[PDB]
Structure formats: structure tokens, C-alpha cells
Design an enzyme around this catalytic site. Sequence first.
Site, PDB file in Angstrom:
ATOM      1  N   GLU A  35      -9.106 -14.109  -3.593  1.00 14.68           N
ATOM      2  CA  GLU A  35      -8.111 -13.325  -4.268  1.00 14.68           C
ATOM      3  C   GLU A  35      -8.483 -13.028  -5.750  1.00 14.68           C
ATOM      4  O   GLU A  35      -8.275 -11.899  -6.228  1.00 14.68           O
ATOM      5  CB  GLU A  35      -6.818 -14.091  -4.233  1.00 14.68           C
ATOM      6  CG  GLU A  35      -6.143 -14.109  -2.884  1.00 14.68           C
ATOM      7  CD  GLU A  35      -5.622 -12.785  -2.356  1.00 14.68           C
ATOM      8  OE1 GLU A  35      -5.675 -11.805  -3.097  1.00 14.68           O
ATOM      9  OE2 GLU A  35      -5.189 -12.794  -1.174  1.00 14.68           O
ATOM     10  N   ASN A  46      -1.632  -2.461  -6.916  1.00 15.18           N
ATOM     11  CA  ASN A  46      -1.557  -2.023  -5.491  1.00 15.18           C
ATOM     12  C   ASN A  46      -1.256  -0.557  -5.358  1.00 15.18           C
ATOM     13  O   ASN A  46      -0.672   0.010  -6.248  1.00 15.18           O
ATOM     14  CB  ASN A  46      -0.474  -2.834  -4.827  1.00 15.18           C
ATOM     15  CG  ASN A  46      -0.761  -4.338  -4.859  1.00 15.18           C
ATOM     16  OD1 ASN A  46      -1.873  -4.751  -4.503  1.00 15.18           O
ATOM     17  ND2 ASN A  46       0.192  -5.155  -5.288  1.00 15.18           N
ATOM     18  N   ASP A  48       1.016   0.988  -3.715  1.00 14.59           N
ATOM     19  CA  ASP A  48       2.470   1.155  -3.807  1.00 14.59           C
ATOM     20  C   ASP A  48       3.055   1.071  -5.243  1.00 14.59           C
ATOM     21  O   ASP A  48       4.268   1.209  -5.390  1.00 14.59           O
ATOM     22  CB  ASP A  48       3.168   0.194  -2.848  1.00 14.59           C
ATOM     23  CG  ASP A  48       3.236  -1.250  -3.354  1.00 14.59           C
ATOM     24  OD1 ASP A  48       2.706  -1.593  -4.441  1.00 14.59           O
ATOM     25  OD2 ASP A  48       3.877  -2.058  -2.662  1.00 14.59           O
ATOM     26  N   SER A  50       3.109  -1.742  -7.114  1.00 12.24           N
ATOM     27  CA  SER A  50       3.292  -3.119  -7.551  1.00 12.24           C
ATOM     28  C   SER A  50       1.922  -3.635  -8.101  1.00 12.24           C
ATOM     29  O   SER A  50       0.890  -2.980  -7.938  1.00 12.24           O
ATOM     30  CB  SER A  50       3.732  -4.001  -6.389  1.00 12.24           C
ATOM     31  OG  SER A  50       2.708  -3.973  -5.381  1.00 12.24           O
ATOM     32  N   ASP A  52      -0.575  -7.400  -8.473  1.00 11.39           N
ATOM     33  CA  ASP A  52      -0.779  -8.764  -8.076  1.00 11.39           C
ATOM     34  C   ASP A  52      -1.346  -9.541  -9.263  1.00 11.39           C
ATOM     35  O   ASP A  52      -2.282  -9.038  -9.909  1.00 11.39           O
ATOM     36  CB  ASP A  52      -1.854  -8.782  -6.954  1.00 11.39           C
ATOM     37  CG  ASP A  52      -1.358  -8.233  -5.615  1.00 11.39           C
ATOM     38  OD1 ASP A  52      -0.143  -8.054  -5.398  1.00 11.39           O
ATOM     39  OD2 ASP A  52      -2.226  -8.016  -4.709  1.00 11.39           O
ATOM     40  N   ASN A  59       2.443 -10.933  -5.851  1.00  7.22           N
ATOM     41  CA  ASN A  59       2.810  -9.513  -5.951  1.00  7.22           C
ATOM     42  C   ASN A  59       4.185  -9.304  -6.634  1.00  7.22           C
ATOM     43  O   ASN A  59       5.165 -10.062  -6.379  1.00  7.22           O
ATOM     44  CB  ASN A  59       2.806  -8.904  -4.544  1.00  7.22           C
ATOM     45  CG  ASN A  59       2.730  -7.368  -4.542  1.00  7.22           C
ATOM     46  OD1 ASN A  59       2.607  -6.763  -5.591  1.00  7.22           O
ATOM     47  ND2 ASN A  59       2.718  -6.751  -3.358  1.00  7.22           N
ATOM     48  N   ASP A 101       7.803 -18.381   3.712  1.00  7.92           N
ATOM     49  CA  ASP A 101       8.646 -17.218   3.947  1.00  7.92           C
ATOM     50  C   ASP A 101       8.661 -16.727   5.435  1.00  7.92           C
ATOM     51  O   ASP A 101       9.407 -15.800   5.756  1.00  7.92           O
ATOM     52  CB  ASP A 101       8.191 -16.099   2.998  1.00  7.92           C
ATOM     53  CG  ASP A 101       9.203 -14.886   2.918  1.00  7.92           C
ATOM     54  OD1 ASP A 101      10.422 -15.111   2.784  1.00  7.92           O
ATOM     55  OD2 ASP A 101       8.781 -13.702   3.049  1.00  7.92           O
TER      56      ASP A 101
HETATM   57 CS    CS Z   1       8.522 -12.721   6.008  1.00  2.00          CS
HETATM   58 CS    CS Z   2      -4.402  -5.578  -4.794  1.00  2.00          CS
HETATM   59 CS    CS Z   3      -5.221  -8.730  -4.293  1.00  2.00          CS
HETATM   60 CS    CS Z   4      11.776 -14.028   5.607  1.00  2.00          CS
HETATM   61 CS    CS Z   5      -1.229  -9.993  -2.658  1.00  2.00          CS
HETATM   62 CS    CS Z   6      -3.625  -6.255  -2.453  1.00  2.00          CS
END
Ligand code: CS
Ligand code: CS
Ligand code: CS
Ligand code: CS
Ligand code: CS
Ligand code: CS
Length: 129
Positions: A35, A46, A48, A50, A52, A59, A101
Site C-alpha cells: 500500500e 482515487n 472517485d 477520495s 488514501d 480512504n 467491517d
Molecule cells: Cs462492508
Molecule cells: Cs489509490
Molecule cells: Cs492505495
Molecule cells: Cs458493514
Molecule cells: Cs484503499
Molecule cells: Cs486505491
Amino acid sequence: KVFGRCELAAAMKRHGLDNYRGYSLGNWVCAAKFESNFNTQATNRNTDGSTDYGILQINSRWWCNDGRTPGSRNLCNIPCSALLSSDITASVNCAKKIVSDGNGMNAWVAWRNRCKGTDVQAWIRGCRL
Ligand SMILES: [Cs+]
Ligand SMILES: [Cs+]
Ligand SMILES: [Cs+]
Ligand SMILES: [Cs+]
Ligand SMILES: [Cs+]
Ligand SMILES: [Cs+]
Ligand SMILES: [Cl-]
Ligand SMILES: [Cl-]
Ligand SMILES: [Cl-]
Ligand SMILES: [Cs+]
Ligand SMILES: [Cs+]
Ligand SMILES: [Cs+]
Ligand SMILES: [Cs+]
Ligand SMILES: [Cs+]
Ligand SMILES: [Cs+]
Ligand SMILES: [Cs+]
Ligand SMILES: [Cs+]
Ligand SMILES: [Cs+]
Ligand SMILES: [Cs+]
């Protein structure tokens, strides 16, 4: 801060990640490697809109607040900048939430694509822990 491999393994262990939700420490080290390359200051935007943040590339769409992600949530209740600190406590605390999650470490696509199923114990081999 750019961690060494064993230095990061030790810090993750100190903060309770080793075998958290059944994921051995090698899984976490491997995820961090792919990462952020162990750099606590890693950021990546990202498509979208957002972003990270940090050693585990958490994120801003769900987990932290950066002030520029429309429609997002801040479930870890922390500013995304706190994820860039040389102290990994905030990243670790937030990752515990994320991995809990529903989909385990598959939340990190790079874990699924590069760590999952592999010899993750290599990531901690040789380390004094
Ligand atoms: Cs989830
Ligand atoms: Cs990313
Ligand atoms: Cs990433
Ligand atoms: Cs969830
Ligand atoms: Cs991520
Ligand atoms: Cs990503
Ligand atoms: Cl390495
Ligand atoms: Cl806002
Ligand atoms: Cl799981
Ligand atoms: Cs643990
Ligand atoms: Cs353990
Ligand atoms: Cs990149
Ligand atoms: Cs990018
Ligand atoms: Cs906001
Ligand atoms: Cs928001
Ligand atoms: Cs919140
Ligand atoms: Cs918090
Ligand atoms: Cs994701
Ligand atoms: Cs495999």
C-alpha cells in the site's frame, strides 16, 4: 517516516495487530508494503475524488475526514492528516475498524491481489518480535 520491515512488524505487534481478527502479522506487513512501501506519509488520490492516507492507505470516503471528499463519513472519527504521523496508533486503530467491517482484509484491494494466499510469514522472517 519510512519504516524498516522488522521495525514496522514490531510496532504493529506493540499496537495489537498481530492476529487481529485472525490475520497474522505477516498479512499486515505485506499490506503495508504494497500500500505505502512502509512510508507513513504516503497519499494517493482515487478516481472517485477520495484520497488514501498513510501506511495502510485508509480512504477518506468512509474512514477519515479530509474536508474535500463529498458525501463521505469519517467512521474512525479522525482527520486524515493524523494517519500520516510517524506514530502508527491512529492508522492501527482505524485499520481495526476497517478489517472488522464484514470483508476482512479484502477491504484492501492490494492485500487481495498481492498478499492473500501467499507466504506472508516471509514478511516477518528474521525479525525479533
Ligand atoms: Cs462492508
Ligand atoms: Cs489509490
Ligand atoms: Cs492505495
Ligand atoms: Cs458493514
Ligand atoms: Cs484503499
Ligand atoms: Cs486505491
Ligand atoms: Cl522490505
Ligand atoms: Cl464537507
Ligand atoms: Cl476474515
Ligand atoms: Cs491481538
Ligand atoms: Cs499473536
Ligand atoms: Cs501511485
Ligand atoms: Cs493516483
Ligand atoms: Cs466534511
Ligand atoms: Cs463529509
Ligand atoms: Cs463520525
Ligand atoms: Cs479517534
Ligand atoms: Cs476498498
Ligand atoms: Cs497461492
